[PDB]
Structures are given as C-alpha cells and as structure tokens.
Write a protein that binds this ligand. Structure first.
Ligand SMILES: CC(C)CCC[C@@H](C)[C@H]1CC[C@H]2[C@@H]3CC=C4C[C@@H](OC(=O)CCC(=O)O)CC[C@]4(C)[C@H]3CC[C@]12C
Ligand SMILES: CC(C)CCC[C@@H](C)[C@H]1CC[C@H]2[C@@H]3CC=C4C[C@@H](OC(=O)CCC(=O)O)CC[C@]4(C)[C@H]3CC[C@]12C
Ligand SMILES: *[C@@H]1O[C@H](CO)[C@@H](O)[C@H](O)[C@H]1NC(C)=O
Ligand SMILES: *[C@@H]1O[C@H](CO)[C@@H](O)[C@H](O)[C@H]1NC(C)=O
Ligand SMILES: N[C@@H](Cn1oc(=O)[nH]c1=O)C(=O)O
Ligand SMILES: N[C@@H](Cn1oc(=O)[nH]c1=O)C(=O)O
Lengths: 764, 764
C-alpha cells in the first residue's frame, strides 16, 4: 500500500517529491523505497503545503478559490513515480489540474509521457536536462529552471579558465547525466578540451562497480587530475565512499554538477575526499518565511504530513512510542525538547519549488481572468479545466516570486536562471563547508581565483602533454586524442612550420632562432680584410713594386748593350703580362661583380699567355741560332688565347652564382665552369711545356751573362710550381685564393729569375 | 475514438501492431495516425488471429482453454501505443495475461515501463535494441529475436571485410537507432574503423531536415562513400526521397540495418537510388499455411478485422460504397475480381510474430502443466494469473515453432537467431530486387563477394587516406581521426621506424631499401686494386728496382775511388732509409690492421729521419773542410726520432677508427692525430732545412764529379717538393695516398739526384 499527503479544496494540484531514497538493487522489483530525506523530501513537502496555505490566505491570487493538493512520494525511481502518476490519472477514467513534476529528469520524462495523454501540464523544479526543450515530444513541460546546456557551457568555461585539458568524465546513468554529458562532450570537443575516457554508472550501483569505476579513474591518475563528474548526489556519494574504501583520500580533484550543488548529506562522513572540489549550484536565495514556518514544526502537531513522524524518528534516531509510529527498530526514546534548528540546513532548490507552485497559481489566475473575468470563482467555462488552455496561459504567464525575480517562460518552457559556483574547502579544525566563489551568467564567468586553493599554486592542471614547443620541439600524434602528444625536436635545418608539421628551410635560406621561418645567410665576400685574402694582397704589392723597379731600370738602361742586345720589345711584353698577372690578384679578390668575373677569366687566360708567348719567342730567337716579325708571332699566340676567352664568353657568361659547400655556409662566386677554367689554362700550360722543351734543348748557351742558363733555371722552377699547383685548385673550396697564389707566384718566379739578375749585374 | 480488434475467449492476450504510419509533425499533438500498412500491419493482425485460431483448434497446446486476444494499433508512435496500453490496464484497476509487444524498441520500452507495474509480461518480435537486455530495468521483456549487439557486430564485420574505413553514420533518433549506433561506434573504434560524422534524425522529420542531412552527407562525398545507416524504414525512405529531390541518384552507397531489411515499400518509386545497397535481415523462412489463409481473405467476409476494409480501400485505391467504408475520397469503384496474390509480398519478420504467440501459448502450457497437471482447464490456482509465475514459466519455456528451430531464452530474455544479408541490385530491365548474398552467425560471416557488384571492381572503398607507405612515406596526423592522414616521405638517412614515427639511422649505419631498419655500409679498404692505389704501387716498384740497381752497383764498385772516397757507410744508411721509405708505400696501402697502423707511423718518422740524418752528416763532412763518429752522430739523430715515435705510441696508440666524411660513405683508417702526424714530420722538416742551409752554404765545391753540386740541386728540388706537399695532406680526404706519393717521390728525388749520376759516370 502507498501513503498519500493531501489537502482538500476546489482545485487539486498534484506533485511528485523524492521523499525516500531510491530502492537498492534486488529491491527494485518489489519497489520498496529506501531511507527518508528532508532536503529533497519533507522540506519540499512542507514548502508545498505552506505555499498552498499562503495562496489560500491571499485574496490577490485566485479569490473565492480553495486550492487543494496531492503529494506523492516519487521515491526518485522511474517506475515508482510512474505508478504514482497512474494513481493521479485514475480519476480521469477530483481531477488533477497539473503537477509539480519530479526531481530527476529521467523520472520527469517518464511521468510526462503518461501525463500528456491526459492533457495534464507538468511544471518541474529540478529536471534541468536539455532534451526536455523539445516541445514536439514534450508539449506539457515548463520548468522554472534553465536547461543544463548552459550548465555544460559553465563547466566548459571553468575547465577552459583553469586550463584543464585532459579530463576524466563520469556521468550518472539516466537521461539527465547522459544528455548533460553529451552537451559537455561536444562543447569541449569544439573548444579543444579532450576527455580521457567517458564512464557511466547507476546511482544504486554495487560497491564492486564503484570500485571498478574508481580503479578505471586511477588508470589515468598522473595526467587526468580533475574529473568532470556531471553526476548526481548519490553517484558522487558512492564515489567518495569508494575513495575511502580504497583509502585514496586526497588523491584527485572532481568537478560536480548541481546534483552535488550544495548538499552536505553527500559529503557527510566523507568530507575529507571532496576537499578542493568545485561545484555549480543554481542561484536561489534563502526563504526566511519558510524558515520561520518550518522550524516551528512539531511531530505531535503535524498530523497532515504522513511522513513527518517517520522523518522525526530518523533525524534523531529516537522513538515516539505513544505516537502512531513506534519504530521498534530504534531505541533511546525522544527527548521532548528536540528542535529542528539544531543543524538546520536550508535546501538550495526549494526556492524553485515555491516559484513552481506560484507559477501554477499565476497560470490559473491568468486563465480565470481571461475566460471568466466578471465572476470571482468557478464559472461554467472552468467546470472541466482545459489542459491546452491552461498551457496557453502558463506559457504567457509572468510574475515575481519569493526571490523577487521575473519568472517568464521562453518558447521552450525554460525559465532563465543564474548559476553560483562553490568550492568545498576547509574553514578551520576539520570544519568543512561549501563557500560561494564565482557566478556564471549568459557566458559571463566572474570568479575569485585567489580564493580557490588559498594558494597561487593550484591543483596539477589536467594536461596530457606539456607545451613542449620551446621554439624547437614539435607535436607528435600517437592517435589517442588531440591533447596527448609525444614530442620530437626539429633539426637545425628545420624551422617549426607548425605545431603538427615542421618543414625545413631550403638552400639560400636558414631558420631563425625561435624557428618561425627562413632567413638569408650572411654570405661571405672576402674583399679587403681577412688574413689569407690580404696575404696575396701584400704578395701582389711586393710584386708590383719589383715590377716598377725593374721596369724603370730597363727603360733607363735601354742604351746599355746587355739590355739592348736581347729583344727589348718582347721583354716589354713579358713585363706587361707580369704586371697584368699582379693585377689579376686584385681582380680576383673583389666584390662579386659581373665585369669583375669577366676580367678575372680575361686576366687568367691572357696575362700568362702574354708572358709565356713572349718567352717562347725569346727561346726561339736564342735557340734557332723575323727581327720585326717576332712581335707578329707573339701577337698571333696572344690573339689565339684572346679568341678562346671571347668564344668561352659566347658559350657561357661567367655570371654571379651562390655557392653551396653545405647548408650553414653560402658564398657568392663567379660561376666559372671546369671547362672554362681548364681550357685557357690548358693553352697556357701547353705553351709552358713548349718553351720548356725549346729552352731545355738549348740550356747550354752561356751568352749574355748566362741569360739562357738563368732562364732554364727559371723554367725548371716554373714548371715544377705549375705541376705542383694542379690538384690544389680542384681539392680546395677556397679556389680563388689558390688561383691568386698560383699565378702571382708564377709571375714572381718569372721576374725574379729573368730580369732581377740582369738588374743586379747592371747595378753591380 | 479508437478502433479495437478482439477475439473472445477464456484467456486474453493483448498485442500492439503498427497498423497505420506514425503521425507527421504538427499532427503528433492531436495524435492522428497516418496511412495504413499491411506488412507491419494487417498481415501481422491476420497472422495473430489465425495463429490464435490454430492454437484454439489444437488439442495439444492448452486443452479446454479458449484463448482470446485484443489487437491495438500501435501507430508506431510512443504516446499512441502508451495510451493503448493504458486501455489494456483499465481492467486491472477481462485482465490481459500478457502482450505481443510493439515493433520499435523505443515504443517497446515506453510500453514496458507501464506494464511491469501491473505484472504483465511482454514478448517482443522486432524490438532488437541491446539496452532491453538489462533485466534489472526490464523484468518482463522476452524477445524472440537476438539483440542488435550481434547486428552491430555483423555490420562491423562487413565494413572490415570490404575494407571500408572512413564511413558516414546516420542513425534514427529513437532508442533503437541510438543504442545500435553506440554499439556499432565503439566496436568500430576497437576494430580501427573510423566514422566521419555521426548524424541523427527523426523518421517523421521535415524534407528540409532530410535535405540538410543529405548535404551534410555530401560534405564528405569523395572519401566517405558508404553510409552506415543504422536506421529504420521511413528514415531510409526519406533519405532516398531527398536523394531524388536533389537528383543525386547513383551518388553513394548506403548500408542499412533490419529497418531496411527486405522492404519494398521503402524503395517503391525510389528504386534507382538504393541500388548496390547492402542490408541485414533476420533469417526467417516463409510461412506457407499463412500464405494459404491470407490470400483467401475477402473484404466482404473479414468482418472481425476492423482495419481490413480500409486496407482493401488503400491497396487498390478503390471504393466499396455498399460496405461500411465508402471512402468518398477515392473514386473508381472496386472490381469484384480483385485478389491479394497480385504483388503479394510476404513480410519477413512475421515468422517471429507467429513464434512469439507460440511462445506465449507454450508458456501458459508449462504453467498449466506445473500448477494444475491433473485438471485440463482453469483450476483455482489460475483464477488470477500470477505474472511472475508466468515469467518463470516463460524464461524456461522451450519448443519448435513454424520455422522448426528451437526457441529458447537466455538469462536476458533474448532468443538466439541468425542473420541474412541482401544486396539491392538490378535483375533485368529496371526490375530491381533484393537477393540473398551471405549469412552472419556467431562471428561466422560467409558471403558471395563476386555476386556483389557482378564485378571485381567494387564501390570505391571508403578510405580517407591511401596506404602511402610505399616503403618510404609515413603517416601524418592532422588530429581529425585515426583514419585521415597526410603523408611525408622519410629522408635517405631516415628509415621508416613505424607508420607514425620515422627515426633516422646513425653514423656507422644506413637504412635498407624498404626502410625497415639500419644496416652496415660496405666500407672501403683500398688494398691491391683501384687505379690511384696501384699508381703508387708501380711507383714504389720502380723505386725498389732502382734501389737494388744502385745498391748492387755500389756494393761491387766499393773498390773504386769515386765510391770509396765518400762515406760509404753513411751512403748505406741513406740507401736503407730510402728502401724503408719505399716499403712505407706498401705499409700505407694495407688492410687496416693495428700492427700496420703502428709500422706506418714508424716508417714515416724514421726512414726520412735516416735519409736526411745521413745526408746532414755528409754535408757536415763536405762543409767543415770524427771519421768513425759520423756514424754515432747519425745514430743520435735517428734515435731522437725513434724516441719521439715511441713516446707518441705511449701517448696515443694509432688504433683503427671508422671514418665519417659524410653519412653515405664510411672508411676504416688509422686514427693518427694531427700532432702525431706533424711532430715527427716537424723533426724531419727541421732536419731538411738544416741540411739545406749547410749544403747551400757550401754548394760551390766541385769535388768528386760535382758531388756537392748535384746534392745542392737535389736539395733545391727536395725542399720545393716538401713545401709543395704541405697543404695537400690537410686539404685532401685521401690523405694516405698523398702521404704515399709525398715520401716515395722524396726518396725517388734523393736517389735519382745523389747516386744515379755516380752510377751513370761509373758505367760511362
Ligand atoms: C694596409 C694593408 C696591409 C691592409 C688594407 C689593404 C687595403 C685597404 C688596400 C692596401 C692596398 C690597396 C690597393 C692598392 C692598389 C690599387 C690598384 C688601383 O686600381 C684598382 O685595382 C681598382 C680596383 C679597386 O677599386 O679596388 C686602386 C685600388 C687598389 C686595388 C687598392 C685598394 C685598397 C688596398 C687593397
Ligand atoms: C700487376 C700489378 C700492376 C697489379 C696487381 C698488384 C699486386 C697484386 C702485387 C704486385 C706487386 C706486389 C707486391 C710486391 C712486393 C711485396 C713485398 C713483400 O713483403 C711485404 O711488403 C709483405 C706485405 C704483404 O703481405 O702484402 C711481399 C708482398 C708485396 C707487398 C707484394 C704484394 C702484392 C703486389 C702489391
Ligand atoms: C592558464 O591560466 C592562466 C590564468 O587563467 C593564464 O596564464 C593563461 O590563461 C593559461 N595559460 C595558457 C598557457 O594558456
Ligand atoms: C581488402 O579486401 C580484400 C579481400 O577481402 C583483400 O585484398 C584484403 O583483405 C584487404 N586489403 C587490405 C590492404 O587490407
Ligand atoms: N539536476 C537534476 C536533478 N538532481 O539529481 C540530484 O541528485 N540532484 C539534483 O538536483 C536533474 O536535472 O535530473
Ligand atoms: N528493428 C527495429 C524495428 N524496426 O523499425 C523499422 O523500421 N523496421 C523494423 O524492423 C527495432 O528494434 O526497433
């Protein structure tokens, strides 16, 4: 048999209150309800009764109308409340005008599926699930609380604001938890906040199952600190019970929804484990007049509540033997001086309960004012109440409740509301309490951060992978989530193109410090400055000094026989070639200009061509033993090389090319090919070997102060140096400087061992 | 008002059949049902009536018991069937003993929530959703069909077997579609089969919504070919209607669940778009006796079915004016010769309907046999039927139905069943039909693949990312799914370590062809063989020939004055040093052995030390102008270098080190340091310069056939070559061969310009 609270009157308003707990497993089939509760139960029942009394005793709302009610124990279970709603609709086969629908969303849905057949409009006070906005399915559902879509938004705001990224997610099995979790999940997926593993559990579940759940949560412990427990009360309670049963007290943070809102009974005796826990409550002020009424209640007086005796038994663990509930299970007969004000905790959500009953009354008020304005009472139009007419009234109904705030309904029967955020911290010596921290309103999340933790070093932020981008090290996806990643450093060639991808620079470019992108390498020019460059400079300087020295001497001493006898013009050609050879040094060490790159090859070809051509003519003159045709012979042999140079310019212009020894170094050189080097060098070398042969053949002529002898000595050394500097130009990467040394030393040897002895004799 | 089919009798068995369609949007509030159906409707109704007739007319099952029934139109909608079930339980305030519960799972759940309060056991025939296995929530639910957990397994088997990986997923809004999709999703996540984007839609949804859904499916078209439509009939119907309304006829494959099982009406007039489509039906054989009964039905005769007239109206679009349903909406009065056998399509699932009613009867049979065996009929124990006793009977009940198969229930009220797979292909000239392809049973998926497509080139397999592992190119996760990846090639240094990660090899190693891992590089040894190596070999050969030549000559001609005059012993020291210098060539070109690496440095130090030491003593003898102390001087100068070599061996042993010019090439050399090279070379060079000075100072002594003259010439050339081969050893990477050339040519020059002229004179 069932127990029914009821107040008589004209118009009856049903309600479903979770007076008892849900039945446990292996009791759900008998449907025998658990232990009583006040804050979800008796408190709400007395709230309804006294609110109905107030509306009876107010001439403003519904004059000449005595409102009645029927309170049914929902027992928080789906089937139980469904049976109670059947007991409501028994009359529709006094008729109930509408209900103040049950707490949990799943139970609400189950009840409304029945109710909307009989056109009985349901007003919720706690059933916050967002799938109840679908007025196609749920025509008769108007809750005075916001949808938990906003609540999932608030939770995602919190986990963004405190940088939690790799979270665990437990939600209660049932429509509230499931729908709310789905909303939180997709919002988090959008806003880039991953979830380790979504778990689900019944509230009445086994301790074994709770322990399994807790171990599964343990399997993500070092990273997934905070649990996004979009849960309900007994779910969180069972979780904390499991935490103590494994002794994992101050292990990890959890973050609860309004199932855990402000409730002490879910933390009672398990306080040490919900520490630091963050919660979201719907913003409801205290109800002072209800306090005044509720605290003056006595079990000997409150006859009209058939649960009140049993509650009075339970709260004080005592017995009223002389009263209709002995409860022989207990002992220690009740002290007559017991009060409710001792540890009175006012329910959070019961403001909404008063608002809901107000909404029902105001709806009826609007209906009365519409259909029969000039008749205070039940006219002929309201003998049977049209449910749809009542709905039309209720959807348009507005007022201010005990909170004083405007109570209006949108197109979804969802009244707007705020949200408060509590932290469950310590106050003093093991006196733990929730305390208001911040508020959420339409996206606006204001919050006192320093209040949380009482310490600027917070809980370990639930991050799977540390921001390993130290300017260098990239993100490596193993394929788990978009928040778990290993890390690989980019190479010195490799700039961090993106978090995910790291493209290298190309040749001619090099990455910056922080590896954003490419740059340009400080290329080397090697003009005036640097040791080795300037080394050849001083060499060429000494060479040019000796050049001018011997030149002036041989100009002045033209009259002398020892100078006059030999071919002075051919000697002048030698001197000019030698001087141009020294100019080749300064032509090579230059800024990489096009005209310079031209003149380099010009010099390298022509000036040794000049020198060895005039020398081969001299060796011919000294060997064969025309006097004005020797110049013509030299002219021919020079113009061949000049033609070769011009033809090679026709073939390929020596342009200005970036050099790449490796990535780290880039030069800017003349793009003289191997053929362009070797071919004029080949012609020069062949002339060298030719004059070598013709001089070595006739080395035994001691004429003109051993002219041929010194020339043969010069030719020996000359050929040795030319053969020595063969592989060096090919092997080196400093090819220009090698060419400088080679040709400059060649001209040096030629001068020093042809004309310097003659000068030494002519001035000795 | 509502319409009730009923057969009178002793025991009444209720049932919910989807006679009409569901109400459309903006009709769901009036709850006015759509158009009639036979295959889900009238066919099933006649099935129940005739089955009840058979069980009445069978003396075997339940003798002296006239079974009755009440058929209620479910209308496929949740609320409608809920109202009908209220109309069932009106008596419980003839009592219905149990129902043959409605088609869809969501409606089944809604009905059972009501029924289990009144202890009325429900047997389903189509409500395949897996969440109905939870006997905690659903104590009174026994379906004669398997759970769709197996069906999701079958679908995942199919999408594995045909290598579909990147699929789209539409499921019907409602518990069947939702739960089945969840099962398919997590199984696919396990078995590595991704889903593009899960969509959901009501069946009665707007054409706008269908078009939105279709465009959202279009947004994944080139990759996500196959849609895993875990849907229901009208969902698939609306999808095909949208396909024609966008004219996207043969666009993409879909894969349907048993909502789409074998139904023609879901493809009727939209046949061209479900082409190639693959479906899963529960394996049920045809029912011949039902065929015989059903086809002989006449609208003038079938009074007992109050839907049959309206169905007869609908199927032929005609009118029976003289009969209680005129249907003035239609025209074209019915031909009296119309038959049902014209386009008779037998329902698939109605075998299960017959089995379900059989199960109810057999359960009652077991209950009768248990409680009152010796009284054929209703005893005192079965005046009111105990629902729980009936459940206990039904959970243990076994039989063989019209299919002939064993009908047993597990602990979950889920009878085992098979699955058949159809393809919706063409037969001929636009005559389209489903045809059986394969079967699924307990994991065993056998299937005729070649039958599908009639072509070995199938539909484009739904793959987001082609297997770009061509032995070279890796997987790059952009963070979408574990099936969408871009691709990056590994470098030549980089072996494919894994699909996700690609680690390079280290120095001393190199990747293989297919880039599995590292190998060992074929290192170079350069012993006998190769041009440049053997070049120095022939050089040393000619040198040793000349060595022995001059040696034998100076041994024989010891008696001669020109040989006798000079220090023969010191000359012998020169010759020995020179010969050891030639041995240095073959010591350098060797396999990299430790003793060899020792002897290399030994030779390079000592043999030029010997040569230049004996030469400096000779220059001292020839310059200062002791006779047996010259040997002692040479011994001192040699032992200094020998001490240096031994001390350097003490400092660092020249061990055998792998060379790294770059990654691609590795040599195996002696690890002679720069100091270990230069220091003995430094001592040698200082001796060279010393004897150079002492010889150049005294170059003007023409004694002993210009001995000092040729020696000075030798020293000139010697010093030039030593100074020439300075940067080459440092610049080259072929350092050993350079050292060979250098020291061998040095010894060559020394011999050729000291002792060869003396031999030429003594034999001229
Ligand atoms: C003091 C020294 C050891 C260090 C700094 C060397 C340079 C700043 C000087 C010293 C000699 C100079 C050169 C002396 C000879 C002339 C030739 C003459 O004609 C050119 O060859 C034009 C080319 C040019 O503009 O450099 C004037 C420039 C140049 C190269 C001079 C340019 C500047 C040089 C290289
Ligand atoms: C025919 C030629 C141009 C091509 C092939 C050359 C080699 C197969 C031959 C020719 C000369 C040979 C060398 C002649 C001198 C001797 C010295 C003698 O004593 C050693 O120096 C021992 C070292 C060793 O075992 O090689 C015997 C080996 C060796 C190096 C010989 C080894 C094999 C060589 C290099
Ligand atoms: C973490 O939170 C703090 C304060 O909200 C702030 O430094 C920043 O928003 C977050 N840090 C990062 C790296 O996003
Ligand atoms: C694709 O399917 C065929 C036959 O089932 C076969 O080649 C193989 O199983 C699949 N291919 C790959 C690459 O897995
Ligand atoms: N918010 C809830 C109900 N609720 O469950 C609890 O345990 N507390 C509480 O407020 C829902 O919408 O179903
Ligand atoms: N399998 C279904 C029911 N069903 O819906 C259809 O459209 N066809 C069909 O068989 C379910 O389990 O709910």
């Amino acid at each position: 048999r069932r127990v029914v609270a009821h107040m008589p009157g004209d118009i009856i308003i049903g309600a479903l209150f979770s007076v008892h707990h849900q039945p446990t497993v292996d009791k759900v089939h008998e449907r025998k309800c658990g232990a009583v509760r006040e804050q979800y139960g008796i408190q709400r029942v007395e709230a309804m009764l006294h609110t109905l009394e107030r509306i009876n005793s107010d001439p403003t709302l519904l004059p000449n109308i005595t409102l009645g009610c029927e309170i049914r124990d929902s027992c928080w279970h789906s089937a139980v409340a469904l049976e109670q709603s059947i007991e409501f609709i028994r009359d529709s086969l006094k008729p109930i005008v509408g209900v103040i629908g049950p707490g949990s969303s799943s139970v609400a849905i189950q009840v409304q599926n029945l109710l909307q057949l009989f056109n009985i409009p349901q007003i919720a006070y706690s059933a916050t699930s967002m799938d109840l906005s679908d007025k196609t399915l749920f025509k008769y559902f108007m809750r005075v609380v916001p949808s938990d879509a906003q609540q999932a938004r608030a939770m995602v705001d919190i986990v963004k604001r405190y940088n939690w990224t790799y979270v665990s997610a437990v939600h209660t099995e049932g429509n509230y938890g499931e729908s709310g979790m789905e909303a939180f999940k997709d919002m988090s997926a959008k806003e880039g906040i991953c979830i380790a593993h979504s778990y689900k559990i019944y509230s009445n579940a086994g301790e074994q199952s709770f322990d399994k759940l807790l171990k599964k949560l343990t399997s993500h412990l070092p990273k997934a600190r905070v649990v996004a427990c979009f849960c309900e009360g007994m779910t969180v309670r069972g979780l904390l019970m499991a935490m103590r049963r494994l002794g994992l007290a101050g292990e990890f943070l959890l973050l609860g929804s309004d199932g855990w809102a402000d409730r002490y009974d879910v933390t009672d005796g398990y306080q040490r484990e919900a520490v630091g826990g963050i919660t979201i409550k719907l913003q409801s002020p205290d109800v002072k007049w209800f306090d005044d009424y509720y605290l003056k209640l006595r079990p000997e007086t409150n006859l009209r509540n058939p649960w009140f005796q049993e509650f009075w038994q339970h709260r004080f663990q005592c017995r009223l033997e002389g009263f209709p509930q002995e409860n022989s299970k207990y002992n220690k007969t009740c002290n007559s001086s017991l009060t409710l004000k001792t540890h009175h905790v006012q329910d959070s959500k019961m403001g909404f309960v008063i608002n809901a009953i107000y909404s029902m009354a105001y709806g009826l008020h609007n209906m009365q004012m519409s259909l029969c304005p000039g008749y205070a009472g039940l006219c002929d139009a309201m003998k049977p109440i049209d449910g749809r007419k009542l709905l039309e009234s209720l959807m348009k109904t507005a007022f201010t409740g005990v909170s004083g705030d405007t109570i209006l309904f949108d197109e979804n029967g969802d009244s707007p509301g705020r949200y408060e955020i509590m932290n469950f911290k310590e106050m003093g010596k093991d006196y733990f309490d929730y305390i208001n921290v911040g508020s959420w309103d339409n996206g606006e999340l204001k919050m006192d951060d320093d209040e949380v933790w009482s310490k600027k070093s917070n809980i370990i932020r639930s991050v799977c992978s540390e921001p390993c981008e130290k300017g260098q090290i990239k993100v490596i996806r193993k394929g788990e989530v978009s928040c778990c990643w290993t890390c690989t450093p980019c190479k010195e060639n490799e700039y961090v193109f993106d978090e995910y991808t790291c493209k290298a620079c190309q040749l001619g470019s090099w990455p910056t410090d922080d590896l954003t992108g490419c740059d340009l390498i400080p290329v080397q020019y090697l003009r005036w400055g640097d040791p080795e460059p300037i080394a050849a400079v001083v060499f060429a300087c000494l060479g040019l000094l000796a050049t001018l020295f011997v030149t002036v001497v041989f100009i002045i001493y033209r009259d002398t026989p020892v100078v006059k006898s030999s071919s002075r013009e051919l000697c002048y050609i030698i001197l000019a070639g030698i001087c141009l050879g020294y100019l080749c040094t300064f032509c090579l060490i230059a800024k990489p200009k096009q005209i310079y790159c031209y003149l380099q090859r010009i010099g390298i070809g022509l000036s040794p061509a000049m020198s060895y051509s005039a020398l081969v003519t001299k060796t011919n003159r000294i060997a064969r033993i025309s006097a004005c045709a020797q110049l013509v012979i030299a002219f021919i042999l020079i113009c061949i090389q000049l033609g070769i140079i011009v033809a090679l310019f026709i073939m390929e212009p020596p342009d200005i090319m970036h050099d790449y020894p490796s990535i780290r170094e880039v030069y800017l050189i003349c793009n003289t090919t191997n053929l362009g080097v070797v071919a004029p060098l080949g012609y020069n070398g062949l002339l060298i070997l030719a004059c070598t042969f013709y001089a070595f053949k006739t080395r035994n002529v001691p004429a003109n102060f051993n002219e041929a002898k010194y020339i043969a000595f010069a030719m020996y050394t000359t050929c040795i140096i030319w053969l020595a500097f063969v592989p060096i130009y090919f092997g080196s990467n400093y090819k220009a400087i090698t060419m400088c040394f080679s040709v400059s030393l060649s001209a040096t040897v030629l001068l020093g061992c042809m004309f310097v002895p003659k000068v030494y004799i002519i001035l000795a």
